[PDB]
Amino acid sequence: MEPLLLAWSYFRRRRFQLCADLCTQMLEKSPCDQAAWILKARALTEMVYVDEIDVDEEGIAEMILDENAIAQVPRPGTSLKGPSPAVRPVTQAGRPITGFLRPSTQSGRPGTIEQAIKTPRTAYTARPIASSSGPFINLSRLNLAKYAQKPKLAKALFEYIFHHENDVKTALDLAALSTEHSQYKDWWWKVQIGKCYYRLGLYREAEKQFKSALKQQEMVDTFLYLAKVYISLDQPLTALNLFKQGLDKFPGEVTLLCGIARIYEEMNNISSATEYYKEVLKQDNTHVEAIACIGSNHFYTDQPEVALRFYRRLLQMGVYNCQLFNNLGLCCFYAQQYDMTLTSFERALSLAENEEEVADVWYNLGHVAVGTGDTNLAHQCFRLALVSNNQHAEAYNNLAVLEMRRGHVEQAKALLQTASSLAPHMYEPHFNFATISDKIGDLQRSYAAAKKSEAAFPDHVDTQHLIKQLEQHFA
Amino acid sequence: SLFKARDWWSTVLGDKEEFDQGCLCLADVDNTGNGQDKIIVGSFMGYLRIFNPHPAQAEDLLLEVHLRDPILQVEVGKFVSGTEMLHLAVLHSRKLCVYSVSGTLGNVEHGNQYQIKLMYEHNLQRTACNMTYGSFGGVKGRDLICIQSVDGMLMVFEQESYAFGRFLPGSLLPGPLAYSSRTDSFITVSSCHQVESYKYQVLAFAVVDWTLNIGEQAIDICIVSFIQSASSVFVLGERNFFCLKDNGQIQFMKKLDYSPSCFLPYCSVSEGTINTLIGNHNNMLHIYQDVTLKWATQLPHVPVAVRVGCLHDLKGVIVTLSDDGHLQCSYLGTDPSLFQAPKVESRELNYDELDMELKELQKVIKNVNKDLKVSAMVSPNSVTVKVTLKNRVALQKIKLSIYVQPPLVLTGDQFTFEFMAPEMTRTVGFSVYLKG
Amino acid sequence: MFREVLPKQGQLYVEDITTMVLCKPKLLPLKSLTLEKLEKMQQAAQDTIHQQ
Amino acid sequence: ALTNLEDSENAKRAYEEAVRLDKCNPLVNLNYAVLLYNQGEKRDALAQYQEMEKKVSSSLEFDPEMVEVAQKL
Amino acid sequence: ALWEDRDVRFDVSSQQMKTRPGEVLIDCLDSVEDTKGNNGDRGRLLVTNLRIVWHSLALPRVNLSIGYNCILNITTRTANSKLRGQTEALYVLTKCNSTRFEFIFTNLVPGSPRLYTSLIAVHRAYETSKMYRDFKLRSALIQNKQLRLLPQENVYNKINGVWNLSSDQGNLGTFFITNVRIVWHANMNDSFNVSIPYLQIRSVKIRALVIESSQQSGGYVLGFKIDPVEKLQESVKEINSLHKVYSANPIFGVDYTDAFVAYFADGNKQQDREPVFSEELGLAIEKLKDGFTLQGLWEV
Amino acid sequence: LNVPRKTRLYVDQTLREREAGTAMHRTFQADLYLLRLRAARAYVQALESSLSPVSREPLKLHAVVQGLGPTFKLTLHLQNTSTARPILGLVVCFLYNEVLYALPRAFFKVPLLVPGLNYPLETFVKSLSDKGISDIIKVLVLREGQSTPLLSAHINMPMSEGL
């Protein structure tokens, strides 16, 4: 009823528009009221809040122009920098496609600025890469030396400056004055200064504050923060020891086990990431990350029924996506459940909020069709995948395979050239182009294509026989 | 049905009303003594409603009284000075009212009426925010009430009148208040992230017994005491979930990945542990054994102030109340249902119309595999050219551009026309001149 | 009461012939919650820009 | 398979396609004779039996149904 | 008597789809394909005053009728991006006599999706107005001393001292007569009030003012007694007249086969086993199915 | 060998298939019919709008965008895919939002396309909005005597990262 009370109760119920809407009134009515002031600050900063732990873009500049790893060429198995590409689709030379895209995924790194620019913008991150990773209150007007004295105001004000305005320097000024006001005895200000540092670039100066905050009071937050810091310095085996220390503190934490599994998958030894995702399951059993990862791994290691179970679980827990339903369709078809197969693809096509998701669903429908026979339906589905996403290399490759099945060799050659131009990291377009060339002749093009195939999937077999035959023809 | 909250007696509770925490209470305000609880809900729109649900039906709603001022945090406790019978407390923003729901019976299912009498009231100087109730100190058979204020002050009533009132040291936005009986302490969560416990006799003498700097501000704090072996205090933040000891340090904590709205540590099972259930803003309930998820369910609405109670011979029914006005008693769904296409022999694929459309589309496909006039006029004189375009059918999103050569430069390049009715002429005029 | 007889011998390849391979079915990876929130906050700004 | 999918007309036309497109495999003729005899005809089942016996020899279980659809027709 | 807003019917007749007297059509949309049943057949959707109807528009026999007192959730899904225009979809979740259905309605032609909005609106108008067509006990009807009237409602007769022959000592109470419903409060602890709608009344006779309910609120016989019977028969005759003139054209106060088996919201489940206690979890849980266990259903 | 292993899930699924094979067959055939219907529908709609970058009359075009910052390099890789037949009269026309992108030459002739060579034809797109706004850009390749595009392509321009 009353303004302040109704606004605060709107805040408790996570409205975040009404709260501010009543405080703006209550502030116009009285220029001297700090309760509604910091309440509107909280509402504004929480309409946009996103926890700093899972925000690890890094970007193109950090990837090359910033060197922090001590060892330049460390032993294979101690640095971050399964099914073969003949079964599991790939994204780079290696790095098979993963389940559960998270905005911290790097999934390989480019070598030079030119390569990173001249590639698709979303081939090394979940979002397109960036070079660098009225108003309620004007930051240049308030004296942070006076709000630092009042911690009740200072905490919400720092959260506002950091997560709403993204002013790391003024946030760090406020946090420094606040920490010196608390005589360096509250772990929260230490963690916040460490976050300011970590997104300023100073990792060691942030690891110092995170360690000093762990000494004050163990919290899952500081453990994950140190994990991020250590992963940024390219030190997996330090992060794993720190995670096992945290699990010694918190015996069954799910985020710590999930971080261990993420590190094991970045190092690409799935035989332990599955164990740790299974521990996460034994703890949560609704975890979307572990369920999706174990489901994908179960699907690609020729066990599609277990993957269908793992994805029906996510269906049972109210998850309603385009990805989930296309996955259910692939699993139902390949696990030989032909009644619930195509309705899942229909729900997928219904739920797709993009033009690339629609293209992927049409690609998978073409796979279903070509598994059924009737190559014309798959032809149409691949052409629609192209019509939806012009830069869809798998559709080009499959449509060229079907074209050469029909007989049109030049169409297949052009389409395979387009596919291999869009995705060089794939091996199928190169191998097919080399095969058709060798079939007609042109052993130079066959060599230039089979060598790129071997560069893409270096443990292939038919590529090796092709290269042997070619090098034999050259003498 | 697996992992859904299957429905029991459910209802919608008004005309775009609004509730909050403390609204949903669940006890024997009728003082029958049989164990079956009764739902009590009061919005800050004004209406106080009490239900005795049976597994929609008309006679379920015991009463739907309306008070003038809004209602905050209905409670059920021994709020009368004389007897040991449960009374219902209604906290309006600037008012306290203890009632008594007395139900008299008639010789038919719907001949029984229910009378609430205002046992006593209390004018509130400050504006109330929320309250707690308990046997402060070591008293028994009494339920004193400690109400907070929106501006920090906490005022304590000894079940009859205004006992006292002390200001909380250093708080701006009032957080959740609770009272621990195994330590006789008022525990709150100040705006500055400090979970603070004050001994009762310390406040009565007016300071902090202890503090703990959790990472956030808490939405709710629920001190549960049905276990006398190892006491604990639950604190649900807006980003985490702590269970603290009685001295002041974290016994354990969970870093939730969702946004909680309500939680309730209900009756436990194992030795020492405590089952708890938390409600997302993603419409789910989670059932932890203190850190470890034991079950999860997909609720209908965003739960506010869930409760668990024995309603009509069924123990442990979960009663949820949204803030828009919904309300629902429910039981977990434990029926794994075969994933299989429905057998509907009646519903057949209509081959005639579908084949007609497919023949049409395939005809277009196999056929393809085998409106506007523009004119330009140059003046006889930097020569001024004029371009006239005229449409037959109505056209849209028209863009006209001119390209001469590198050296020659135009004074106008692009011209945009929007929709145009049929048989409408459009003229543009630009000038071309040599530059170089 | 006669049951149709099925051949007990399948078709066996007697030579490996180089056939053009198809790309493989692509399981669409799911998203996190932070990623969905970031994309929605990125598109809400666009929507407000267009709606002014 | 079709015969077991509650679609006998499609099985009829598929067997017609097969017998037109098969030259040196009597199993098709015997199976079409079995389908016909199970359909209650017993008329064209003799035609398929005679087509098979014109086509013809090693399978153990195609031998018995050869003689059982013979004697019962 | 009235089922249009109380049931969910499949393969309905060409007559039951027609607007009931009190019903009134609001909005319509052609080419709305039906899904959750993969017949891939188009149709036509109608958002009436009391229920939502869908008929195949090519074989108008097969159809759907969903009442508004049997829907729980209505969700609009804007997807299927740039490839064509932004087309919508309607997800309706229904629970009739403890059986959960779900229907999906796909707007094929992306040129007219406005319908899916108005429905939502009228559904609110259906729920914000239940004192017009439903029976309620002990509600919050009375103001300080007078009745709180519905929008389309005015009082006819204002009688004091009308007893209630269903209780013992809390009887004497006022009797309000209106054009939509008749109410009686208790004039002493005025929360024992009954608000009977004309829609639920079956026959008003005397045995004494006996009022019977129409098999929906059960056989609820209501008995009242007044001062000398002159005003009594007067009230009875005027009540019968108002009942008939209302039943002529109902108001509803809304301001502004195997078919079922293919529409289950659960999936091959039209059931709810007896909810029994659970010693494992401590909650009332649905009975387990002949060998299954909780810790075996939970794991994967 | 590495022959796989099947759990209880597999035998339960095969039992369901053995007991309910007819319904699965029928419903999968119905779903396949509906899928053919919808695929033909979308193919006809694409032919109508001529949105296929691959479509007698042999051609193949796809547009690549490169570069962050307010200026992007947009290179159209176009290719004649035929045995031996060049294509003389063709021309490319861009469709953009003239308030967000400043294309210098939004329409230009294409060279004589020799069968087998990928011609990169590039342009400089430039973002004009001071606020980050990502809008699609259409490309139409069409004859000079006809008005219906021979083929088309789409490009979602990324964010500007301006100043």
Numbering used by the authors:
A (entry chain F): 1 to 81, 90 to 141, 158 to 499
B (entry chain I): 2 to 56, 63 to 213, 234 to 397, 410 to 420, 439 to 493
C (entry chain H): 7 to 58
D (entry chain E): 347 to 402, 408 to 424
E (entry chain G): 6 to 212, 219 to 267, 296 to 339
F (entry chain D): 425 to 479, 483 to 590
What wording appears in the published article?
Patched 1, GPR161, SMO and other ciliary membrane proteins are all ferried out of cilia in a regulated manner by an evolutionarily conserved complex of eight Bardet-Biedl Syndrome (BBS) proteins, the BBSome. Our recent cryo-electron microscopy (cryo-EM) structure of the BBSome revealed that the BBSome exists mostly in an auto-inhibited, closed conformation in solution and undergoes a conformational change as it is recruited to membranes by ARL6GTP. Here we determine high-resolution structures of the BBSome alone and bound to ARL6GTP, and we map the BBSome–SMO interaction to model how the membrane-associated BBSome–ARL6GTP complex recognizes its cargoes.
Following on our previous strategy, we purified the BBSome to near-homogeneity from retinal extract and analyzed its structure by single-particle cryo-EM. The advent of higher throughput direct detector cameras and faster automated data-collection procedures combined with improvements in data processing with new tools implemented in RELION-3 led to a BBSome map at an overall resolution of 3.4 Å from an initial dataset of 770,345 particles. α-solenoids, β-propellers, pleckstrin homology (PH) and appendage domains are all present in multiple copies and our previous map made it possible to build a Cα backbone model that encompassed 25 out of 29 domains. For building the current model, the previous Cα model was docked into the map, and the higher-resolution map enabled us to confidently assign side chains for most regions. The new map allowed us to build the coiled-coil domains of BBS1 and BBS9, for which densities were not well-defined in the previous map. Altogether, 27 out of 29 domains distributed across the 8 BBSome subunits could be modeled. Despite the increased resolution of the current density map, the gamma-adaptin ear (GAE) domains of BBS2 and BBS7 could not be modeled, and side chains could not be assigned for BBS2βprop, BBS2cc, BBS7βprop and BBS7cc. Fitting a homology model of the bovine BBS1βprop–ARL6GTP complex in either BBSome structure caused a steric clash between ARL6GTP and a region encompassing BBS2βprop and BBS7cc. These data support a model in which the BBSome exists in an autoinhibited form in solution and undergoes a conformational opening upon recruitment to membranes by ARL6GTP, similar to other sorting complexes such as COPI, AP-1 and AP-2.
